[PDB]
Amino acid sequence: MAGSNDVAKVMKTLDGMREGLIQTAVELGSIEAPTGREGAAGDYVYEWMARNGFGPERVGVFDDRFNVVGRLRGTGGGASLSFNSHLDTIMAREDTARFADANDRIYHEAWHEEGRIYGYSVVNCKGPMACWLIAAKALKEAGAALKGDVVLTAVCGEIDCEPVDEFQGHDYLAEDIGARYAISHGAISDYALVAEATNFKPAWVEAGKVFLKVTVFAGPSRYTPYVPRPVAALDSPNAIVRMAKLVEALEEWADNYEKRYTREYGGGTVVPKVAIGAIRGGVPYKIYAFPELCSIYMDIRLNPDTNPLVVQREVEAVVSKLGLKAEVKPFLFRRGYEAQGIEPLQNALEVAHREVVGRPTERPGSPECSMWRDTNPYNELGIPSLTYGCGGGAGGGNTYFLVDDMLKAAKVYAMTAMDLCNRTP
Amino acid sequence: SNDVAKVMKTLDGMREGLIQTAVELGSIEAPTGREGAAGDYVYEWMARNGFGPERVGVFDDRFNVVGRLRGTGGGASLSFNSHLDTIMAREDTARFADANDRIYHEAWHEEGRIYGYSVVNCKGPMACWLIAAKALKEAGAALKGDVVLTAVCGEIDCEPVDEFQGHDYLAEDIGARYAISHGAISDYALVAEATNFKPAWVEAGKVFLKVTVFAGPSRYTPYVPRPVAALDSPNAIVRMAKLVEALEEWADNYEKRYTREYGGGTVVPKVAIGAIRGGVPYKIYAFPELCSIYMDIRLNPDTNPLVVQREVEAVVSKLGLKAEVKPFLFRRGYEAQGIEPLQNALEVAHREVVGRPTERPGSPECSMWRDTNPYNELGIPSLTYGCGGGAGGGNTYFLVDDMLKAAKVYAMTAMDLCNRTP
Numbered sequence A: 001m002a003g004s005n006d007v008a009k010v011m012k013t014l015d016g017m018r019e020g021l022i023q024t025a026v027e028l029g030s031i032e033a034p035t036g037r038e039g040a041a042g043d044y045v046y047e048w049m050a051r052n053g054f055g056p057e058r059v060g061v062f063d064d065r066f067n068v069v070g071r072l073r074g075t076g077g078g079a080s081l082s083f084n085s086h087l088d089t090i091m092a093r094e095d096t097a098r099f100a101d102a103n104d105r106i107y108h109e110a111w112h113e114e115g116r117i118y119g120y121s122v123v124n125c126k127g128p129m130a131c132w133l134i135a136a137k138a139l140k141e142a143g144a145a146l147k148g149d150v151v152l153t154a155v156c157g158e159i160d161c162e163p164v165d166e167f168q169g170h171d172y173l174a175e176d177i178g179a180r181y182a183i184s185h186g187a188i189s190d191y192a193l194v195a196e197a198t199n200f201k202p203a204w205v206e207a208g209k210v211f212l213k214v215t216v217f218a219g220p221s222r223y224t225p226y227v228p229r230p231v232a233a234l235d236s237p238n239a240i241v242r243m244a245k246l247v248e249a250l251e252e253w254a255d256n257y258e259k260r261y262t263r264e265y266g267g268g269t270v271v272p273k274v275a276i277g278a279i280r281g282g283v284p285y286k287i288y289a290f291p292e293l294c295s296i297y298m299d300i301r302l303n304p305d306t307n308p309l310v311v312q313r314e315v316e317a318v319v320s321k322l323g324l325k326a327e328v329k330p331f332l333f334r335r336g337y338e339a340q341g342i343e344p345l346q347n348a349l350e351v352a353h354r355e356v357v358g359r360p361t362e363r364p365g366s367p368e369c370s371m372w373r374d375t376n377p378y379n380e381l382g383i384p385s386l387t388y389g390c391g392g393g394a395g396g397g398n399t400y401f402l403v404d405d406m407l408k409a410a411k412v413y414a415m416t417a418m419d420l421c422n423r424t425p
Numbered sequence B: 001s002n003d004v005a006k007v008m009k010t011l012d013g014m015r016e017g018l019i020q021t022a023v024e025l026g027s028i029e030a031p032t033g034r035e036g037a038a039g040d041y042v043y044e045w046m047a048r049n050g051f052g053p054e055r056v057g058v059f060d061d062r063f064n065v066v067g068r069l070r071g072t073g074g075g076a077s078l079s080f081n082s083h084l085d086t087i088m089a090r091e092d093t094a095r096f097a098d099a100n101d102r103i104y105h106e107a108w109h110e111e112g113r114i115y116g117y118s119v120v121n122c123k124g125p126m127a128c129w130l131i132a133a134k135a136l137k138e139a140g141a142a143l144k145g146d147v148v149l150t151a152v153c154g155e156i157d158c159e160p161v162d163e164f165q166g167h168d169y170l171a172e173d174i175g176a177r178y179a180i181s182h183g184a185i186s187d188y189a190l191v192a193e194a195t196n197f198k199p200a201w202v203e204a205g206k207v208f209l210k211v212t213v214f215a216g217p218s219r220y221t222p223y224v225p226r227p228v229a230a231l232d233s234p235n236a237i238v239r240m241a242k243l244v245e246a247l248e249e250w251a252d253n254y255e256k257r258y259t260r261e262y263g264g265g266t267v268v269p270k271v272a273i274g275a276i277r278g279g280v281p282y283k284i285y286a287f288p289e290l291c292s293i294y295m296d297i298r299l300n301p302d303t304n305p306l307v308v309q310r311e312v313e314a315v316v317s318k319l320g321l322k323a324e325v326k327p328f329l330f331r332r333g334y335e336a337q338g339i340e341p342l343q344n345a346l347e348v349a350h351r352e353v354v355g356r357p358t359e360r361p362g363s364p365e366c367s368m369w370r371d372t373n374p375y376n377e378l379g380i381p382s383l384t385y386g387c388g389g390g391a392g393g394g395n396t397y398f399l400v401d402d403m404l405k406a407a408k409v410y411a412m413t414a415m416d417l418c419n420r421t422p
Ligand SMILES: N[C@@]1(O)CC=C([N+](=O)[O-])C=C1C(=O)O
Pocket: B219, B220, B221, B285, B286
């Protein structure tokens, strides 16, 4: 495996699909699809799949935020392979609170130039998606012989947004309604390749995460004309002032956390990092009396073998060490996984890659193995899964794909399927 | 120590609140899909008793309720978990001969007993640990670790499929797993359900299959071809009738073949055809070219859903029928790992309160869906334990005496386990 030169026919068929590949990627990439509003992108993919005869279904918690699942049905007796990429993209209509430059052309558009396709939404993640969409089209139209099904899974809400506090429900949900939902409601297979920009480097371990809301307490609040001064920062009745000290302690803890929990796996080396993604205390429209509490929100990545409570307790000890009183409240926990029994997919992939790209695969860097990918939900559910695709990673952060690379990735995908899907499950 | 004795007879002094909480909770209409009001009651109950509840939910009218009894520090934390939804809706006339019988929809205190399917499943076991927590708090029990109080929506096996999508039809995806994934974590979790004081720490997974038989061509009744052998009938309903018989045979043997013994219980994974539809009753002058059944196939923890799908496809091809066999639900079952500390804390409290070692649970009770699966899936070793016979069995009432024992077992388990070191 794979096949004979059933492969040759499919490779040429893909050669002839270069314009479709670019067109699909630009059209998809041009659709505004920040997490929370992936619907329009979903609709595009549904119709694309319908046109091409993959019998898509919308599989979603919400009628405007859904996954799209289609299939290329095999003849029987082979392993099934899922291809998966996500529908949502990074920058909403205006993320001025995160980024200082929340509106550049590259951040909200996509176009074909030279032999490149530009746009963050192409890098992450409409480009890799176009690649396996085309791969499947070629397989279908070439009449490739496949015993197993190919499952086509475009998912919403991959990006790490989460409800918390007063931000609840439809507008703020993500991973809970995405890949895991799609799989749990029918999109199952023997194996799954998650297409993301990895520069043709396969990973099959990823991090989990625990998000902590840390609320430091102080008080009592006083009207500004009555505030006691001077007072040592850690004793300040202003929770914001205490939080400032806590923040630098947590930064120290974080510097060492990633070192202490670094851990090497067959699938990659996890370097689990920590960042303080938000802070808020008091409200901007009533500032005449300082707040008795102040909260930060921490993103703490987990290697697959770390219980979230171990991390919560470590943060609680940083707080205690400072003599502060705080609530350390988790509001998100997802496990990361190393794929188990990945070998058949890893092998079929390695063989396809060598043929198409012409060299052995390189091992990915740590960040690419220490993040969230939808390989976690697949592996969680017993579907061995790895991530692989063309392009320098979005978090790199790349701003374009080479059309040559995309075409290579499409071929790798088609070859992988023609091999793996003809193995007996 | 000697808090135990104090708590024990804080609890016997609470028989009134236990009964009232169970009857009031059980009296709230809360079929899966409409569990909101039950959630509100639980939230308000938690708030009055100082457990600082939070609504944790995908929808503002279908949510989990998570509360907490905070420990002094340095101990293991324990979740108590029960679900807010109940089995019967007043409209389930499609399922039950008399879907409006009082036992399905009401709860009441009579003599020694509390009647109501909604108390058996699951307001009764919920009241048990609600009261246990209240007793632990008020008696000022010393606890190093937290007790996490987790009332979840959407535990019951309802699922979207076909045109039935979204809010009204979701369940487990927005229930316990959602609650845990969004903060309700602990070192251990006790899922309070009716188990007749027998602990289970293995449960089944499941794959739901939509099986659609194709036939045709459809004809206006005055043109229908007869006689035609069943398997050749242009009427998909007629073909499906023969397939149903074959799948019943497969199901008979399936549970034998995949029966499997675990430390946490013996799993006997069963199969049932839960629904059928072909054609529509308001247009019956031309028979349908397709007909669908919907299969509930339980999985032991070590069975891949695709193996099962293939087996069903094999039954179809042996009859020589054309059909789509389509999975529309798959969830894994788990045997807990590292359950020993909870198992032990439970066993000690149980022997003391109930006065005899625990027995292994009956196979159905560890061959079903329970929210131990999400906890174990997420690395929180979890077992299920509580008073009374299983609703699915199904039992109709709880003895208030049993409810009290359960509450005491819960309280004692916490005082032990939450004072061990994490
Ligand atoms: N009498 C009817 O109009 C009613 C129903 C059908 N039909 O089953 O398509 C045909 C008729 C016909 O012969 O015209």
